[PDB]
Amino acid sequence: PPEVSPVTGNPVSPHYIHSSTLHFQDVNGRSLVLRGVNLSGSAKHPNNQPSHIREGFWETAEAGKGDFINKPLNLDDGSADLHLARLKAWGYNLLRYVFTWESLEHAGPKEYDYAYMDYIIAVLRKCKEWGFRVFMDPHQDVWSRFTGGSGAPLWTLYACGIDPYHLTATAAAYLHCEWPSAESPKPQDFPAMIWGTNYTHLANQTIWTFFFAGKTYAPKCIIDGKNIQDFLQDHFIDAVGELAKRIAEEAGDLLDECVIGWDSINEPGEGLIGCKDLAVIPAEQQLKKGPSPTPIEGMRLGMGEAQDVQAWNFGPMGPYRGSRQTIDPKGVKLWLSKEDDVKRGSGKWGWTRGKEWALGTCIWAHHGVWEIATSTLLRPDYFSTLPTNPGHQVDFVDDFWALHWLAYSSRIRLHHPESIHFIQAPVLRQPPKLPESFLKGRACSSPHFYDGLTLMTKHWNWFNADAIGVIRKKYWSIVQAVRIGEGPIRKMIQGELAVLKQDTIDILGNYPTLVGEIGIPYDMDDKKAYGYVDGGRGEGDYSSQQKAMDCSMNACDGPNCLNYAIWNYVPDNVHEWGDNWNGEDLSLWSVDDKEPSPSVIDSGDFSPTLILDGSRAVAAFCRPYPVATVGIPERIDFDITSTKFKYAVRVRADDIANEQVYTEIYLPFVHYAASLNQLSLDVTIVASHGRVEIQGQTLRWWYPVPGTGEEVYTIEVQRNGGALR
Numbered sequence: 001p002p003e004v005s006p007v008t009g010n011p012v013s014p015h016y017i018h019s020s021t022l023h024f025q026d027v028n029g030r031s032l033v034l035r036g037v038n039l040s041g042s043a044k045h046p047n048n049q050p051s052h053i054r055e056g057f058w059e060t061a062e063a064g065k066g067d068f069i070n071k072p073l074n075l076d077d078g079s080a081d082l083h084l085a086r087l088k089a090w091g092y093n094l095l096r097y098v099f100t101w102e103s104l105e106h107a108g109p110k111e112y113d114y115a116y117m118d119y120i121i122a123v124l125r126k127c128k129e130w131g132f133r134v135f136m137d138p139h140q141d142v143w144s145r146f147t148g149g150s151g152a153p154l155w156t157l158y159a160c161g162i163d164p165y166h167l168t169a170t171a172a173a174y175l176h177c178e179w180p181s182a183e184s185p186k187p188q189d190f191p192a193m194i195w196g197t198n199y200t201h202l203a204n205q206t207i208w209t210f211f212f213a214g215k216t217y218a219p220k221c222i223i224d225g226k227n228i229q230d231f232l233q234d235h236f237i238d239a240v241g242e243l244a245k246r247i248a249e250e251a252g253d254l255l256d257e258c259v260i261g262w263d264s265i266n267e268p269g270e271g272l273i274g275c276k277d278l279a280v281i282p283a284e285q286q287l288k289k290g291p292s293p294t295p296i297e298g299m300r301l302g303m304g305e306a307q308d309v310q311a312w313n314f315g316p317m318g319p320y321r322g323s324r325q326t327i328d329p330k331g332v333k334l335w336l337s338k339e340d341d342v343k344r345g346s347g348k349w350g351w352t353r354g355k356e357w358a359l360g361t362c363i364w365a366h367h368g369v370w371e372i373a374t375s376t377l378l379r380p381d382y383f384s385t386l387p388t389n390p391g392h393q394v395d396f397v398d399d400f401w402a403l404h405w406l407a408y409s410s411r412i413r414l415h416h417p418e419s420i421h422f423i424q425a426p427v428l429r430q431p432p433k434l435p436e437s438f439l440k441g442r443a444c445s446s447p448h449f450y451d452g453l454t455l456m457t458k459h460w461n462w463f464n465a466d467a468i469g470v471i472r473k474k475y476w477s478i479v480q481a482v483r484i485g486e487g488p489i490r491k492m493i494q495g496e497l498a499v500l501k502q503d504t505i506d507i508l509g510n511y512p513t514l515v516g517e518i519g520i521p522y523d524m525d526d527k528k529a530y531g532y533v534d535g536g537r538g539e540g541d542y543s544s545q546q547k548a549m550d551c552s553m554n555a556c557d558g559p560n561c562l563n564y565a566i567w568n569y570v571p572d573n574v575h576e577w578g579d580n581w582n583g584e585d586l587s588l589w590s591v592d593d594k595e596p597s598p599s600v601i602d603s604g605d606f607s608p609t610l611i612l613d614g615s616r617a618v619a620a621f622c623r624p625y626p627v628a629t630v631g632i633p634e635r636i637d638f639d640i641t642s643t644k645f646k647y648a649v650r651v652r653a654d655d656i657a658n659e660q661v662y663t664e665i666y667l668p669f670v671h672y673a674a675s676l677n678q679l680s681l682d683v684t685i686v687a688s689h690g691r692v693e694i695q696g697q698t699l700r701w702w703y704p705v706p707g708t709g710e711e712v713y714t715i716e717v718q719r720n721g722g723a724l725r
C-alpha cells in the first residue's frame, strides 16, 4: 500500500484502512476482512412510534417533532455497552450505522436536530472505544415512514404537493399503521413483505421521479425558485453533510480510525423513470404482491376515480396473478389542494411554490401524460425518453442516480476528506461507471443481497431459485433457475454473491466489495419457534432459521471471502411485532429469547450467557473468519455440524511478515469452547506452514513468505470431541 492517501496525497494515520485494491488493507499490507451487523433498524422510527401504532404517528411529525434519542443504543441505562460487548464477543469488527433524514431535519427545512447528532457522536465514540470500524448509512425505505417505510421528514410530502392523509384511500401508499383502513386498522394482518411494493404505488412513483429527475419530467414543479429535484436533493445532501461536518468539527478523532466512510442513499427508488409503457406492469418488475395498479391506474386512483386492478400472490416461483380487485377512493384525491398548501404546506413549512405547479390535481396529467376529462393516457412512453430529445432512451442508473451520487460524494469528501465511498447502486442494478476524478482510489462496492425466496415466504424451502440469473435472463425458463437440496441451493447462493464481486471489478475498478445488507427472517412458519402455533410445539427450534442464515453466510465464504454487515440487530425486537417495522423480523437477538470491559472480552473471560442468551440461530451467524491476513484470502470453509474450519491464504514473496505482522483469525467460543455451561478454546489446529498461538477467541498465525513467486498456505481448525450442545 502507498505511503500517502490517493485522495489528498497526505500521509495516513496508522489506523488507515486502504481501499485502493480488491481488498481492504492496513498500513502493513495485511488484507482485512470486515464483518458485522447493521445497527440498527430500530433507528428507523422515533421512540414509541413503531410501524403498527397509529396513535401520535401523524400528529407528532406534523408538529415538527422527531425524538430518536437513545436509538439504536440507550446511553442512560448501561445497556449500550452490553450490546456492544456481545457483538464484539461474536467476533464482529464492523457496524453499518443507521440514521435517517427525518431524525436530522424533522423540525423543518434547515432546522437540524443537533442534539441527535451529538447523540450519534456519543454512540460512535462508544463504538470506537469497543474497537469497531463504522461506515454511515443514510437510510430510507419507500421514501419515508409516511409513505410506508423510513427516511425522509414528513414535510417533504407537502413539498411534493401530496396530502399525506389521502394516501390510503388512493392506494398511493400502504401504511402498516392504516392497514386495511385508517378507520379500523388491523396491523397484524399486514401481508408479509408487502411494504416493498410501495415503490410501485403512486406516492413513491411520483416522489422518486421528482427526486432524481424533477427537472426532466416535472419542469413546472418549482419550489423556492428551484425545481423540486434540486429542492429535495440539496436538502437531503445538506442534511447528511451537516452531520459529517459536525463529526469533523466536534469529534474529528472518529474519522478514519472508526468512521471509515459513508454509504450512498439507501436502496433509492426509481419512480417512473424508465417506464416503457405506463399502461402495463412489465414482466421484468420482479416484485408484485397484493393490489397492484399499473402506473396509469394508480394515477386515476390519485384523482379519486375507482379502478379494477390486478392483485398478485407470491408463489413458489415468484409472483403470479390472482383475482382482480376494485379500489374505490370515492372521489378522495391524493393531491394537496391550494387551500391546504397554505394551511399545511408551503405556508406552514416556509417555502414558495411556483405558479405553474398545479395543486389539487394530478401533476403528471398537468404535464400532458394523460387527460383527466377523458381519463385517457396520452404519452404512455413519457418516462422512456427525454421530452427534450425523444431519441435518447433513459438509463436510471447512468442518467440520474449517478449524477446524484456525484453531488453527494463531493459533500462527503468536503467534510470527511479521507472518506471511503461505499457505493450502493440501486437494488439489483449494476453500478454505473464512475470517474476516478471522484473515486480517487478510495471506494468500496456496497451492494445488498437477500435470499429473496426465504424472505418473502418466511420459510426455509427445500427448493430455491437463482434470482440474479432470472433478472439477467440467463435461463430459457424460470423453472431452469430452480435448485433442490441444501448443497445445490448453497452452491447457487454462493454463485450469486460472486456476481456482486464481478460487478465491482468489471465496472467500478479494482476495489473491495462489502455486502452492506444480508440476512434472513426469523418469524418463519407463523412463528412456530416463538411457540405461537401447534399448541406451542417447536418453540425454540431455530433449525430452519439456522440453515437459511448458514446458507447466506456460507455464500460470503468460499472463494468470495466477502466483507459484509448482517441485517440486523434490534435491541427492542420482540416476538409479537418483530423488529417493530412492517412485520420484518431479522434481528439476531431478542429479549423474548432470554432464559464488562473490552479488555475482558478480548480476554475471553466473560460469561457464556452474553453470547447465547437472547440469540437466535447463533451457530449460523457467529463464525470463524480471518480478521487480518498476511497475503490474500483464497478460500474460507466452515461447517457447523463438524465445526471444521479451513482457510487458504495466497502468500507472496513480497508480502510483509514478521513478529508483529501476522495473520489473525477469530475462533468463536460458540463453536469451539470447551464448554458453555473460564471460557477456553478446545481445538485441534493443523497449519501447512509456520506456528500458531491461541488466547481467548483469537488465533495468531505466523509464517514466512515464499522465497519467490507465490504459494498457498492452509490452516484447519476443529473442536475436540465434536460439536457443542
Ligand SMILES: CN1C[C@H](NC(=O)Cc2ccc3c(c2)NC(=O)CO3)C[C@H]1CO
Pocket: 041, 196, 267, 427, 428, 448, 449, 450, 451, 452, 453, 467, 468, 567, 584, 586
Ligand atoms: C430485510 N429488509 C429487506 C429490504 N430490502 C430489499 O428487499 C432489497 C433487496 C436486496 C437484494 C436482493 C433482493 C432484494 N432480492 C433478491 O431476490 C436477492 O437480492 C430491506 C431490509 C431491511 O428492512
Ligand SMILES: [Mg+2]
Pocket: 108, 109, 110, 349, 350, 351
Ligand atoms: Mg425555512
